Amino acid sequence: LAELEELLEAVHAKSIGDIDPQLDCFLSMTVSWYQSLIKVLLSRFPQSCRHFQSPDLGTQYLVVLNTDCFVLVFLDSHTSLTVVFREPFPVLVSTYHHLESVINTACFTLWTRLL
């Protein structure tokens, strides 16, 4: 977790809402919804998902690696949805494809709670 936090300080991250306004509703999702989405992402892509949690489980970080670009989901029980890139954001299709899979996973989790 410490290495991920240190690496995140030297990387460029953009929130999901910045790329597409329609995803901004995901920023208002509850902590339980965020945990359910993290569990769904871990179940769907265990090989590409990395989970880091604090000893008291207050802060949980879920990263879905693609490898220079990844989607990071951070939740503080005691939430954020941003895409982390090692270099500055380009002014590309693989990054959009990675976001589409995460968007579908978030959409799938939201639909489950409605039934």
Binding site: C25, C107, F108, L110, W111, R113, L114, L115
Partner: protein, 393 residues
């Protein structure tokens, strides 16, 4: 001040749907303060009238304009009645005037909401309901009434209003989103409506708990939710069932068949289960709900297919039936029956939506006078359009 505390208590009672308690408290305060200023008595009378009007609106028995107009006139008279002969403090008088203005704005908003509800009840009898126009009108009304009663004294009333009105909006867009075959925004709107309904139910349960505490350990009747809340919950359930029926394939692709069937059985009505039962009983070859993608064979793909994938062989026959019987399908009430001797197939087509078509195809010669299939198609169309919920609202 005592007047501010009384107003806060009345507003808190109103926000918990305790109109009778708020009216009784206002009447008691007015009776005990007969020697106070005339503005205070006018405000108390206006508050009692507004509580009665709110109770009537919650009961939804007006489906109200005269009562709202009288309340607005009383509030305007109280605001403009700057009578210093009552001995009230000038700060108290200014607070009363601001409260009267906020109450007049709230009364106008309530009158607009009642007019919208009456329009929806009138349009319930229409074969097709334009959800986009209703959503736009609701958004315009909300924007006009936005931040009009943001006073902290009116805090629980306004929170009780928007959380309901937005809920209605959360339904309206959903009614459009289901019509446009949009799954993600329909699901988001349904989740928002469910959250708003749960928020309203929290206040209802708080009021019920307060009533139970006041009534002791006796087996008192539970505080029933108002007719508006029940209608909103029924509309949300109907919209969720319609979305599940339309988006059955997407939900079922992520789970097993048994789990998908169990999930669909909870939705009221369960269109998928009824369709499967009808297919099993009548030995129907295929039942396909196809959404028209024109303007958004591939132009009319089968969104839902039972009990298997959509027969490709019957695709051009269904396309020809839809094209030739376009005028009949446009009525959204008639059912078109076709027979093909080359394939010896019987096709029954209905159009519950202008962009959705339900087709039942059987590999046998079926007479057009078979009332069972026509009745089933009519019931399915009525469930999909959902005019009964709006009629009962």
């Amino acid at each position: 001040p005592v007047e501010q505390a009384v107003l806060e208590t009345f507003f808190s009672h109103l926000g918990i749907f305790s109109y009778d308690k708020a009216k009784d408290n206002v009447e008691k305060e007015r009776e005990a303060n007969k020697s106070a200023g005339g503005s205070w008595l006018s405000l108390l009378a206006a508050l009692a009238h507004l509580a009665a009007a709110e109770k009537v609106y919650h009961s939804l028995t007006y489906l109200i304009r005269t009562i709202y107009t009288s309340l607005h006139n009383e509030l305007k008279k109280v605001v403009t009645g700057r009578g210093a002969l009552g001995g009230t403090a000038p700060h108290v008088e200014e607070l009363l005037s601001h409260l009267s203005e906020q109450l007049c704005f709230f009364v106008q908003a309530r009158m607009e909401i009642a007019d919208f509800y009456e329009k929806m009840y009138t349009l319930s009898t229409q074969k097709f309901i334009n959800a986009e126009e209703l959503v736009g009108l609701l958004d315009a009304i909300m924007k006009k009434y936005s931040s009009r009663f943001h006073h902290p004294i009116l805090s629980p009333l306004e929170s009780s209003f928007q959380l309901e009105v937005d809920v209605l909006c959360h339904l309206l867009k959903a009614q459009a989103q289901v019509s446009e075959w949009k799954f993600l925004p329909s699901l988001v709107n349904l989740h928002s409506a469910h959250t708003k309904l749960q928020t309203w139910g929290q206040i209802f349960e708080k009021q019920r708990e307060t009533k139970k505490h006041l009534f002791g350990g006796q087996s008192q009747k539970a505080v029933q939710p108002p007719h508006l809340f029940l209608w909103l919950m029924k509309l949300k359930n109907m919209l969720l069932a319609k979305f599940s029926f339309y988006f059955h394939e997407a939900l079922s692709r992520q789970t097993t068949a048994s789990e998908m069937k169990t999930l669909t059985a909870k939705a009221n009505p369960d269109f998928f289960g009824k369709i499967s039962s009808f297919i099993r009983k009548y030995d129907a070859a295929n039942v396909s709900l196809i959404f028209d993608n024109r303007g958004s064979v591939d132009q009319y793909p089968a969104v839902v297919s039972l009990p298997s994938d959509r027969p490709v062989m019957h695709w051009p026959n269904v396309i020809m039936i839809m094209t030739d019987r376009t005028s009949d399908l446009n009525s959204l009430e008639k059912v078109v029956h076709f027979y093909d001797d080359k394939v010896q197939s019987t096709y029954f087509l209905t159009r519950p939506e202008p962009h959705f078509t339900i087709v039942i195809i059987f590999e046998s010669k079926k007479s057009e006078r078979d009332s069972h299939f026509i009745s089933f198609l009519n019931e399915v169309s009525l469930a999909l359009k959902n005019p009964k919920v709006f009629a009962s609202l």
